[PDB]
Amino acid sequence: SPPPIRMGVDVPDRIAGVAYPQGTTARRLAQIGAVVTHDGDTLTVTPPSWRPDLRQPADLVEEVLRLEGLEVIPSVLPPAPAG
Amino acid sequence: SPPPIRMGVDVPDRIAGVAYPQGTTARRLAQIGAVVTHDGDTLTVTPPSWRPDLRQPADLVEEVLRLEGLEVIPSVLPPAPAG
Numbered sequence: 001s002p003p004p005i006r007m008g009v010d011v012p013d014r015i016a017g018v019a020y021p022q023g024t025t026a027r028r029l030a031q032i033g034a035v036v037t038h039d040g041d042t043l044t045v046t047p048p049s050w051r052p053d054l055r056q057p058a059d060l061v062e063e064v065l066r067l068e069g070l071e072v073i074p075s076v077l078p079p080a081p082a083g
Numbered sequence: 084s085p086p087p088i089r090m091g092v093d094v095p096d097r098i099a100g101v102a103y104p105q106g107t108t109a110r111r112l113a114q115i116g117a118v119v120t121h122d123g124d125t126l127t128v129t130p131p132s133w134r135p136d137l138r139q140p141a142d143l144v145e146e147v148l149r150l151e152g153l154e155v156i157p158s159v160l161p162p163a164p165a166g
């Protein structure tokens with residue numbers, strides 16, 4: 001098994017800009033074969049041996065977002081910086 | 084005496100974007116000759132008879148801001164959206 005990865009429970013929600021229902025991140029990461037443990041608001045995710053592409057929290061975010069679907073991500077224009 | 088005006092004690096601080104010291108609003112409004120009473124967090128201000136221009140809380144904001152000096156107002160760029 002690859003080394004474990006610590007990631008905030010709401011990190012996929014913050015990156016996607018979507019308040020996913022509770023347990024959405026943990027269920028998806030378990031669906032792809034990873035061991036998910038809880039420690040307050042921080043998850044510890046050990047990806048399966050056939051997923052060495054999962055090395056960082058960003059890799060885990062891609063798993064939750066692609067399984068939940070990118071079509072649920074809303075179109076929100078960022079604020080205009082004073083250019 | 085013109086009719087009394089009710090205004091939050093922090094309204095000049097919000098309009099100016101400046102955290103004025105404690106009691107600055109009530110001090111400046113009594114200086115120009117108004118009667119100031121405290122009802123929790125809301126002030127009740129009765130302008131003097133020689134100040135009929137003081138009819139709304141915005142007029143009271145100008146009195147506090149101009150006596151403290153507009154130079155203390157910082158320069159912050161607004162959050163303009165994508166045009």
Ligand SMILES: [Mg+2]
Nearest residue numbers: 053059062063
């Ligand atoms: Mg990936």
Ligand SMILES: [Mg+2]
Nearest residue numbers: 136142145146
């Ligand atoms: Mg005025």
